[PDB]
Structure 1
Amino acid sequence: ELINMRRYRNAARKLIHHYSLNSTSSTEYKISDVVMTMIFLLRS
């Protein structure tokens, strides 16, 4: 399986939480993180 579903989880949260917690973000995260989250949501 290409997707490491476990690692793809945390990411989502991190942002999902992070974004839900704080509308705006900063350098803290990456485009890699966004891709990770979206791929997780697709797979689940």
Structure 2
Amino acid sequence: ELINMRRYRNAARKLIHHYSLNSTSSTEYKISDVVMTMIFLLRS
């Protein structure tokens, strides 16, 4: 098995921070990124 949970978590945390606090749209960030977020959350 080989997955970069590390970078995934990193981007995901950054995401969740800004997203949950801005409460609004994420033009910097992408669907791939939220996907990796949920991936982290499944594997953790």
Q: What TM-score, normalized to structure 2?
A: 0.78
How many residue pairs are counted as aligned between the two chains? 44
* CA RMSD across the alignment: 1.3
Q: Which runs of 5+ in 2 are unaligned?
A: none
Contact 1:12 1:41 in 2 (8 A): no
State, as a whole percentage, how many aligned pairs show the same letter: 100
Moved over 6 A (4+): none
**Match of 2:22?**
22
Contact 1:8 1:37 in 2 (8 A): yes
Deviations 1:1-44 (A, max 9, x none): 24211011112201110112211023211011111111011111
Q: What TM-score, normalized to structure 1?
A: 0.78
CA distance in 1, matches of 2:41, 2:12: 8
